Amino acid sequence: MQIFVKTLTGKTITLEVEPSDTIENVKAKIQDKEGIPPDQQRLIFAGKQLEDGRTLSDYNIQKESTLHLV
């Protein structure tokens, strides 16, 4: 699945992921993309605060879903 992550500046990061990727995995991908350390990252999808050890499917994140770094 393709997802979008919007940075604090509104920059778009396009990520290739799998339903079962954890939020931890996503944070490492964001690190590689923009150099933001994972401890510095806080993610939201549809107003839910996302936990590192849960998966994209766990939050009903889907193809073309947008996430926000907050």
Contact letters for Zn ion, residues 27-56 (x by CB under 5 A): ------------------------------
Which lies closer to Zn ion via its Cβ, residue 7 or residue 25?
25
Strand stretches in 1-70, DSSP E: 2-6, 12-16, 43-45, 48-49, 66-69
Site for Zn ion in 5-24 (CB under 5 A): 18, 21
SS3 assignment, position 48: strand
Question: Which residues lie near Zn ion (CB under 5 A)?
Answer: 1, 18, 21, 25
